[PDB]
Amino acid sequence: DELYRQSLEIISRYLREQATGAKDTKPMGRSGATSRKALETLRRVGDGVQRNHETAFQGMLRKLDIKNEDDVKSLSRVMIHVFSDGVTNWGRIVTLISFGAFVAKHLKTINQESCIEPLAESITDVLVRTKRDWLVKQRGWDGFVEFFHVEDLEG
Numbered sequence: 001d002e003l004y005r006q007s008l009e010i011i012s013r014y015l016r017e018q019a020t021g022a023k024d025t026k027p028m029g030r031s032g033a034t035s036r037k038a039l040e041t042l043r044r045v046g047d048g049v050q051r052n053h054e055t056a057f058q059g060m061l062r063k064l065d066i067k068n069e070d071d072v073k074s075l076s077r078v079m080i081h082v083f084s085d086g087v088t089n090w091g092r093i094v095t096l097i098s099f100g101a102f103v104a105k106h107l108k109t110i111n112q113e114s115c116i117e118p119l120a121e122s123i124t125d126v127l128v129r130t131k132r133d134w135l136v137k138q139r140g141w142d143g144f145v146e147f148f149h150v151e152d153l154e155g
């Protein structure tokens with residue numbers, strides 16, 4: 001399952017990088033160039049989403065009350081409720097992942113760093129297993145990269 005593997009890698013790295021503030025230096029697995037550009041896009045676009053919706057993000061985090069492993073495991077049901085049961089576009093996928101990074105940073109702050117990789121798996125499961133058809137039709141991570149590609153300005 002190349003799409004799942006690639007998705008997990010991109011999401012995991014972003015969540016870890018967001019939580020730790022440090023870049024993972026290991027190479028990507030398969031489809032390295034796309035996965036690298038995908039991660040770079042998420043850095044650009046995801047950070048803005050978290051700031052543009054700061055207050056709503058804080059409010060949802062406070063409402064969820066995430067303390068431990070069992071609370072983190074309960075999030076997949078909420079993700080299916082909010083994300084899966086609605087229209088699909090790249091914007092809503094960025095929000096799924098950006099709120100994930102927001103939860104990841106919270107987990108670091110309460111010393112629950114070990115729950116981050118499970119969280120990343122849960123997000124990936126929801127994204128890939130409920131939206132595979134849409135993702136394939138939109139060209140997967142190549143389509144993601146192409147969608148958010150910004151052309152250089154004329155100097």
Ligand SMILES: CO[C@H]1/C=C/CCN(C)C(=O)C[C@](O)(C(=O)NS(=O)(=O)N(C)C)c2ccc3c(c2)N(C[C@@H]2CC[C@H]21)C[C@@]1(CCCc2cc(Cl)ccc21)CO3
Pocket residue numbers: 053056057060075078079082083086091092093095096097099100103119123
């Ligand atoms: C009102 O607060 C919202 C913020 C909305 C601003 C962004 N916006 C305009 C959206 O439309 C985001 C949205 O696509 C969405 O549908 N939001 S909404 O249902 O609440 N409503 C249409 C605004 C949208 C798309 C995808 C979302 C999602 C919202 N979640 C709820 C967001 C996090 C703060 C909640 C967050 C959520 C659901 C909550 C649990 C969770 C946990 C993880 Cl680890 C990752 C994601 C999520 C599902 O992912």
